[PDB]
């Protein structure tokens, strides 16, 4: 039999005139991933996973990352956090009652600790 040819090949391409900034940002975030996902339009997608079996008792990953970003963006404007806390408790992504309260009380403390030296030079 004949062996597998190497995947890397010289490829013809002509440079366009105008390029957006965020296109450069997404390219330079991870160039191999960019070459796969915008040059020849494939994506090795981790397909849509199954529904989690229960309500989240504890938060990790993006499910707390966007919460941290939203809390920092709210706290940098020196606004009330109780309104946004009510918003998330209405949305339904917090532990029931006391555990969510304690989670909020520690997350707000750490984001305020960052936000003090953030706002020191605003």
């Amino acid at each position: 039999g004949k062996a597998h040819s190497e995947f890397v090949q010289p490829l013809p391409f002509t440079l366009p005139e105008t390029v957006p900034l965020e296109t450069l940002q997404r390219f330079w975030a991870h160039p191999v991933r960019a070459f796969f996902q915008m040059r020849l339009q494939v994506n090795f997608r981790t397909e849509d996973s199954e529904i989690p079996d229960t309500e989240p008792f504890i938060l990790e990953g993006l499910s707390r990352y966007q919460i941290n970003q939203q809390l920092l963006n709210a706290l940098v404007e020196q606004d009330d956090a109780e309104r946004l806390f009510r918003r998330f408790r209405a949305a339904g992504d917090l532990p029931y009652g006391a555990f969510g309260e304690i989670f909020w009380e520690t997350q707000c403390q750490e984001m305020q600790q960052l936000a003090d030296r953030v706002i020191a030079c605003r």
Partner: protein
């Protein structure tokens, strides 16, 4: 949406569990219909945050 458990409050109280009033199909459909009704940034109404996605001509699936 966040729908994981059984159907209604009778179902969650029949198996002798506290009525959390959330993460059920009635709660999810109410959230989705309220999100069809208004926008999400305007605020909560009945401790339910409306869902931003379904607003167009796709909502017959609801």
């Amino acid at each position: 949406s966040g729908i994981r458990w059984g159907i209604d409050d009778d179902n969650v109280r029949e198996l002798e569990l506290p009525a959390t009033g959330q993460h059920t199909w009635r709660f999810g459909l109410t959230r989705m219909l309220l999100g069809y009704a208004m926008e999400s940034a305007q605020g909560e109404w009945q401790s339910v945050l409306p869902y931003d996605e379904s607003s167009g001509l796709i909502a017959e699936l609801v």
